[PDB]
Amino acid sequence: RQNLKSTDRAVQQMLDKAKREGIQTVWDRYEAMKPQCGFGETGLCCRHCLQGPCRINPFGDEPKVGICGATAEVIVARGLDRSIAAGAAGHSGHAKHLAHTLKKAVQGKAASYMIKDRTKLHSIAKRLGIPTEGQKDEDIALEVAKAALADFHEKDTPVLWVTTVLPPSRVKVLSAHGLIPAGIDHEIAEIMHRTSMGCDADAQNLLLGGLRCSLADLAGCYMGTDLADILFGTPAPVVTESNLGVLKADAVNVAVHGHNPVLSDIIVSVSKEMENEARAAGATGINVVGICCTGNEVLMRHGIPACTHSVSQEMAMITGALDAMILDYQCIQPSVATIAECTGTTVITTMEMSKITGATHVNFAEEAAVENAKQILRLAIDTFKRRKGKPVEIPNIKTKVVAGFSTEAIINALSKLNANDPLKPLIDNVVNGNIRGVCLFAGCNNVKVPQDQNFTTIARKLLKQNVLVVATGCGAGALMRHGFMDPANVDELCGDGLKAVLTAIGEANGLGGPLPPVLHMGSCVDNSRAVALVAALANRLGVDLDRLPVVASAAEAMHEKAVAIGTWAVTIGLPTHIGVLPPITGSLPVTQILTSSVKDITGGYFIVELDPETAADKLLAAINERRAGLGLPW
Amino acid sequence: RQNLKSTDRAVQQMLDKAKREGIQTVWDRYEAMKPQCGFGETGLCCRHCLQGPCRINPFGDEPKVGICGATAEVIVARGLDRSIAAGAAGHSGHAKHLAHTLKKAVQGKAASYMIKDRTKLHSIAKRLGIPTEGQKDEDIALEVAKAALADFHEKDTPVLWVTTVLPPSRVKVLSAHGLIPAGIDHEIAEIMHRTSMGCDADAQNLLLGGLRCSLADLAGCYMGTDLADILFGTPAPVVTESNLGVLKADAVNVAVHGHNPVLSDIIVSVSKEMENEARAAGATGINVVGICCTGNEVLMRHGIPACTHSVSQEMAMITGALDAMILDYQCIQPSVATIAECTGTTVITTMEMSKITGATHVNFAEEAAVENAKQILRLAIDTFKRRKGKPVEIPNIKTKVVAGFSTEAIINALSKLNANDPLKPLIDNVVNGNIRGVCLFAGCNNVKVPQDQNFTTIARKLLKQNVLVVATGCGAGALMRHGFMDPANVDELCGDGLKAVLTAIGEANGLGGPLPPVLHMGSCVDNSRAVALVAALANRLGVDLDRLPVVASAAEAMHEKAVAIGTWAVTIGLPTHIGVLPPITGSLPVTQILTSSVKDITGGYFIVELDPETAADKLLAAINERRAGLGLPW
Ligand code: SF4
Ligand code: SF4
Ligand code: FES
Ligand code: FES
Ligand SMILES: [Fe+3]
Ligand SMILES: [Fe+3]
């Protein structure tokens, strides 16, 4: 039964096709891996030196300790810290790329890029303390780019993409515990050092370092969103579609996959100039579709329809209609390069540090972006021509998606109810119980969990209990593909209080109907937008984030990046659910820190719960405990 | 039989004591780990996301590929790259600490530190291009410290502690392959990114990134040596002793253990001012002894005797006479904190990012170094008092050690034969066959190998074949403890040609006898001194390093740092032996790159050989192939 693999009907249909065609999928590779190693599952394995591999039995007799003397506590904490550092390295590497792109753009070195959002640029400069009065925009932008790059290393200030984005009282709590990062790449390196053999060997000390590195990840996320908004525009509400039915047999279908809008944004613009060239080849046009975060980026800004996400990404190929898959980095199953031989798809890498054996590599340079995009799209057009006459099987399955809810857009929507105190109508409805609290869904799909099952099960229970639900990344992807971003489903999905608020906001925005059930706040770096919203609420209320009825759920987490995000959610003060097991259960002391005693440090805490109906109850309890702490009914 | 555990008789004696006293050692923890996991041993395990753990059978049936599609090639290369990045993070973290210390010293913020080697400071400034004429030393030093810190991040120049230390022709080869690092912490982060899930998935591309990150490690090593020489003095020839017999029952015995001379150098100086305070407590004085690299640092500069190294570090404690073990970071078995409860030793950590549960922590600040050192040494004095009346068992085993052969010191010794062309007498004797070639022994001991057995077996064979042998780190430690640094053993150990050269140099230096059989070039960062010597020889000859009859051997390697060092030795052009299995054999394509096709990229290559008599033959063949390529007899 394909329903045990994915709850998405389009994915189920393509799983049937892959099976009859003998094309191995992620689910088949998972089945072939079972049973998985219990040492790795519990975190009780270490390969940090050539005396290893070392392992510790979770229970029973020897081995009980690593060869060097490393305890279970130490081994588990060191492994977790390296995962946080790896996640930080990815989000902040993405941000660094955008900083260099902005710098090039304003220095005259990359004319395909420009300041598109001047309002965003000036507001970021003001937040950072960079003067704007009497300065040319290009000079302000150069200073912002230089400040972004300076946050990667030690200097006379800490990381400003932490200290300028959280309220002073939160920064103070963190500073008292030594948790403010000194530099993003500095912290990543310090983790790698401290976790190497014969260094840090105290679980609490190790985990404090991990919390600090998670804040370096947050800075990378926030910097990425900031810079992408300057370069490509801050999102506003947009209407599009999702799921495999957005592919079109009669078009050149091009997926943008990976992460950085420096690549996907140009593919979108250049594809429109090439419509007549695609038509000369017998297509109707070029149909750009999204996969994973770079898909979210172009969905949020341009309404490009999302094809699929995360674990099911191979299924777009199995249709037979995917002419090209254009990749930068992160979250791309390398299986795509071999599946392409069977499906005909042209898989194209573009970044020097992210190649896949068997894929075609087209170097992308920001200095030649338009030229490089045309070379890529001409490969896609050629591939379309080669499938002239082949039947394709595109499931006729799609949902309507309203998205584009940046924090600026949410504030603007609320301002239609209260022009000069936009956050107040949200707060009023929390106080009166029409909004019980807020839950951010974030993160990936994971082959261990039937695809989307945790996201939808938890979201349904929260929505019925009047929780305002926001989402990013492939959590937003799951919810969009199951109709949670279609305002036509508000009546079915939402409790009466939440429906009343979504309707009041929507009617004030001229929609004649509500906002959607779930607000799509963007890509995974755009988890930083949720931070901006929550920090703005905390500041408006004069309380810290750990007193707000706000929770997060990485319900189906996979990537090291999702571990980093969950960790900074805890660090900034949120109850944070994770719906898969991180490799921590082999140490009860480490588990106790992450799920309990960190409350006394940051006010946040992990909630590890694999059963989604139980997870929803635990998330509601966390929200309601925060309501009670504010003196509110619940 | 303790000879299967260690070839060091003092270690054997303490293993007997530990056994009868029920104190578990590293060897016992290794026995309890057997059989070790074959997936980890071969590199065929991945835990880079929460879909894992993934494994690949080396041979047979499924699993054959990771869940995301990662091949054996990819998994092996990604794991290796993360080990290189971790090694870079340690050596360069050490260097960064020294850069901040020098900066503080010359800004008036840390008066226990100063410019001790003004000649070294000016020569480093000249090498970097920093002007010195008409500048105050403190201003030159501030500029050098600032340049050191700038090499950690991207800027308008590549990493100068690579490009200014290798000859232009070598830099050109590396640059053509994209291998020059852009910034030290930048490269570490880029490795962590590219090796995270769904990123780089091409073995050759991954390994090129690893070679580049290994050059970031080299820069950290060279920067560490440079800055420590400025602050603490460039080594010159010194005579001391090694092995456990350097402990003294009637003294306060204090081991300095870990890595950074910012800590050990001050412990040495302050201990002398506290002699009368130790005597009031009934001791003869404070006897500072070394373990691991920080021991090597104070041995090289001050003649502090070395107690033990690497795998046998617990044995110093088992004597019952070790009153304190003063730690900073790296290579410290965390077992020491629990062994201390049985032996009475006071284990003291000092660095915020390297704590050990159960050890006493005394924060060390460079701004208060002397005060903090006295607090630490008073704990040691108190511990001595508590063992009044307890028998101790110090093996009466020690060797004489001549050390202090910095590259400056080697050039100066050679200059007694040829004042204005000091390298020429060395080259002349290579040409005439009195010196067959040069071999650098480097790296750790590893519990899998009977301690020291590979270092001594290989060195004996090379010395008899007239190879000039230099050593660093715990390879120098092994050789010193077995008499290879005592000039009285030249007749026994050295071939006639090598004896003739060591005698000619020694007699010209007024010794009435030879240089020692092996030249101790210092700590592990001081592998950079061997680079300086080899680069100077290459420059004098007008050839690149990959034409010289110079090889390296990490004969008993353990730490991620040793993997990084071996990798940069290959990258700079050396045949590089490793005497333990790195986790690569699960991929034949990766093994073939590292042992064969990298020759076409850098001219260097790994020689993986666990049998030391065979390794010696392979190293001699590599030397002789280089002689033949220069047209020399062999
Ligand atoms: S660091 Fe310690 S626990 Fe890890 S592999 Fe090495 S000896 Fe084993
Ligand atoms: S990155 Fe790929 S091979 Fe590694 S644990 Fe995740 S699914 Fe498995
Ligand atoms: S023993 Fe299986 S993850 Fe290491
Ligand atoms: S399966 Fe043993 S190292 Fe992972
Ligand atoms: Fe993502
Ligand atoms: Fe060392």
Contact B333 A558 (CB under 8 A): no
Residues B325 and B387 in one domain: yes
- Residues from chain A contacting residue B192 (CB–CB below 8 Å): 85-86, 88-90, 188, 192
Q: Which residues contact B280 (CB under 8 A, 6 or more apart)?
A: none
Closest Cβ opposite residue A188 in set B54, B192, B329: B192
Spatial distance between the Cα atoms of B616 and B575, rounded to a whole number of angstroms: 12
Bridge partners for B550 per DSSP = B438
Given a contact cutoff of 8 angstroms between Cβ atoms, the answer to whether A467 and A459 are in contact is: no
Residues A459 and A543 in one domain: yes
Going from the Cα of A534 to the center of ligand 5, the distance in angstroms, rounded, reads 21
Surface-to-core class of residue A31, CB atoms within 10 Å of its CB (0-12 exposed, 13-18 middle, 19+ buried): middle
Bridge partners for B306 per DSSP = B242, B290
The answer to whether residue A48 is domain-embedded is no
CATH number of the domain within which B184 lies: 1.20.1270.30
Given a contact cutoff of 8 angstroms between Cβ atoms, the answer to whether B12 and B3 are in contact is: yes
Q: Which residues contact B106 (CB under 8 A, 6 or more apart)?
A: B115, B138, B139, B141, B142, B145
Q: Which residues contact A241 (CB under 8 A, 6 or more apart)?
A: A305, A306, A398, A399, A400, A401
Residue A346 phi, psi dihedral angles, 5° rounding: -95, 110
Going from the Cα of B199 to the center of ligand 2, the distance in angstroms, rounded, reads 11
The answer to whether residue B583 is domain-embedded is yes
Q: Is A100 in the pocket of ligand 3 (CB under 6 A)?
A: no
Mapped to the 3 state alphabet, what secondary structure does A194-235 carry?
A: HCCCCCCECHHHHHHHHHHHHHHHHHHHHHHHHHHHHHHCCC
Given a contact cutoff of 8 angstroms between Cβ atoms, the answer to whether A413 and A505 are in contact is: yes
Bridge partners for B287 per DSSP = B253
Peptide bond into A53 cis (omega under 30): yes
What burial letters (b/e) apply to B586-620, b meaning 16+ CB within 10 Å?
Answer: bbebbbebbbeebeebbbbbbbbbeebeebbebbb
Spatial distance between the Cα atoms of A178 and A195, rounded to a whole number of angstroms: 18
The three-state secondary structure class of A388 is coil
Given a contact cutoff of 8 angstroms between Cβ atoms, the answer to whether A299 and A401 are in contact is: yes
- Residues from chain B contacting residue A93 (CB–CB below 8 Å): 189-190, 193
Bridge partners for B402 per DSSP = B239
Domain count for chain A: 3
Residues A185 and A312 in one domain: no
The answer to whether residue A56 is domain-embedded is no
Residue type, A506: G
* Token pair listed for B207: 């390994």
The answer to whether residue B26 is domain-embedded is no
Q: Which residues contact B358 (CB under 8 A, 6 or more apart)?
A: B337, B338, B340, B341, B347
Interface check for B581 against chain A (CB to CB < 8 A): the answer is: yes
CA dist B112 → A478, B128, B234, B270, B369 (Å): 60, 27, 18, 10, 6
What burial letters (b/e) apply to B330-342, b meaning 16+ CB within 10 Å?
Answer: bbbbbbbbbbbee
The three-state secondary structure class of B55 is strand
Q: Which residues contact A136 (CB under 8 A, 6 or more apart)?
A: none
What burial letters (b/e) apply to B503-534, b meaning 16+ CB within 10 Å?
Answer: bbbbeebeeeebbbbbbbbbbbbbbbbbbbbb
Contact A86 B192 (CB under 8 A): yes
The three-state secondary structure class of B387 is coil
Residues A223 and A244 in one domain: no
Sign of CA dihedral A621, A624, A626, A629: negative
**Closest ligand 2 atom number to CA of residue B196:** 1
Given a contact cutoff of 8 angstroms between Cβ atoms, the answer to whether B600 and B207 are in contact is: no
Domain of residue B150, residue span: 61-235
Residue A32 phi, psi dihedral angles, 5° rounding: -70, -15
Tell me if B221 is assigned to a ligand binding site.
no
Residues A226 and A281 in one domain: no
Q: What is the dihedral of CA A326, A330, A331, A337, to 10 degrees?
A: 50
- Residues from chain A contacting residue B50 (CB–CB below 8 Å): 446, 448, 557-559, 562-563, 580-583
How many distinct helices (H) and strands (E) make up chain A? 27, 16
- A 204-233 residues with CB below 8 A of B? 205, 209
The answer to whether residue B27 is domain-embedded is no
**Closest ligand 2 atom number to CA of residue B52:** 5
* Token pair listed for A9: 């009907």
* Token pair listed for B93: 């973290």
Instruction: Look at residues B182, B214, B235 and tell me which one is the last residue of a structural domain.
Output: B235
Other C-beta atoms lying within 10 Å of the C-beta of residue B282: 12
The three-state secondary structure class of B309 is coil
Rounded to a whole number of angstroms, the distance between the first and last alpha carbons of chain B is 41
Residues B377 and B459 in one domain: no
Residues B152 and B263 in one domain: no
Q: Which phi-psi region, left, alpha or beta, contains residue B54 (left: φ > 0; alpha: ψ -120 to 50)?
A: beta
The three-state secondary structure class of B399 is strand
How many distinct helices (H) and strands (E) make up chain B? 27, 16
Nearest CA to B159 among B235, B111, B199, B212? B212
Residues B427 and B528 in one domain: yes
The answer to whether residue A207 is domain-embedded is yes
Ligand 2, CB cutoff 6 Å, lining residues:
B 46-49, 51-52, 54, 66-68, 70, 75, 197
Spatial distance between the Cα atoms of B127 and B146, rounded to a whole number of angstroms: 15
Residues B222 and B79 in one domain: yes
Interface check for B63 against chain A (CB to CB < 8 A): the answer is: yes
Using what technique was this structure determined? X-ray
* Token pair listed for B358: 């159960």
Residues B203 and B308 in one domain: no
Given a contact cutoff of 8 angstroms between Cβ atoms, the answer to whether A256 and A288 are in contact is: yes
Eight-state DSSP code of residue A489: G
The three-state secondary structure class of A255 is strand
The answer to whether residue B369 is domain-embedded is yes
Residues B255 and B309 in one domain: yes
Nearest CA to B340 among B386, B407, B275? B386
Q: Which residues contact B451 (CB under 8 A, 6 or more apart)?
A: B5, B6, B7, B8, B11, B310, B311, B312, B445, B478, B556
**Closest ligand 2 atom number to CA of residue B67:** 7
Given a contact cutoff of 8 angstroms between Cβ atoms, the answer to whether B586 and B72 are in contact is: yes
State the pairing for strand pair B605-608/B575-578: parallel
Spatial distance between the Cα atoms of A186 and A181, rounded to a whole number of angstroms: 8
CATH number of the domain within which B506 lies: 3.40.50.2030
Nearest CA to B142 among B96, B113, B102? B102
The three-state secondary structure class of B253 is strand
The answer to whether residue A252 is domain-embedded is yes
Given a contact cutoff of 8 angstroms between Cβ atoms, the answer to whether B575 and B622 are in contact is: yes
Interface check for B491 against chain A (CB to CB < 8 A): the answer is: no
Mapped to the 3 state alphabet, what secondary structure does A64-129 carry?
A: CCCCCCCCHHHHHHHHHHHHHHHHHHHHHHHHHHHHHHHHHHHCCCCCCCCCCCHHHHHHHHHHHC
Spatial distance between the Cα atoms of A301 and A238, rounded to a whole number of angstroms: 8
Distance of CA B25 to the CA centre of its chain: 23
Residues B346 and B415 in one domain: no
DSSP for A259-311, please give it.
Answer: S-HHHHHHHHHHHHHTHHHHHHTT-S-EEEEEEHHHHHHHHHHH-PPEEE-GG
Instruction: Look at residues A404, A427, A454 and tell me which one is the last residue of a structural domain.
Output: A404
State the pairing for strand pair B346-349/B360-361: parallel
State the pairing for strand pair A550-554/A575-578: parallel
> Within a 13 Å sphere around the CA of A479, how many CA atoms are in the beta-carbon half?
36
> DSSP H helical segments within B303-368, as ranges?
314-318, 336-343
A239 sits in which H/E element: strand A238-242
* Token pair listed for A292: 């994973």
Bridge partners for A327 per DSSP = A257, A349
Q: Which residues contact B77 (CB under 8 A, 6 or more apart)?
A: B203, B206, B207, B210, B587, B590
Instruction: Look at residues B218, B235, B252 and tell me which one is the last residue of a structural domain.
Output: B235
Interface check for B495 against chain A (CB to CB < 8 A): the answer is: no
Spatial distance between the Cα atoms of B2 and B16, rounded to a whole number of angstroms: 8
* Token pair listed for B240: 């001391």
Spatial distance between the Cα atoms of A584 and A599, rounded to a whole number of angstroms: 18
Q: Which residue has the tokens 């400003």?
A: A160
Percent of chain A that is helix, strand, coil (3-state, to 5): 55, 10, 35
Rounded to a whole number of angstroms, the distance between the first and last alpha carbons of chain A is 41
* Token pair listed for B215: 């050059």
Strands (DSSP E) along B200-259, which ranges? 238-242, 252-257
Q: Which residue has the tokens 């009825």?
A: A549
Surface-to-core class of residue A420, CB atoms within 10 Å of its CB (0-12 exposed, 13-18 middle, 19+ buried): exposed
Residue B354 phi, psi dihedral angles, 5° rounding: -145, 85
Bridge partners for A471 per DSSP = A441, A520
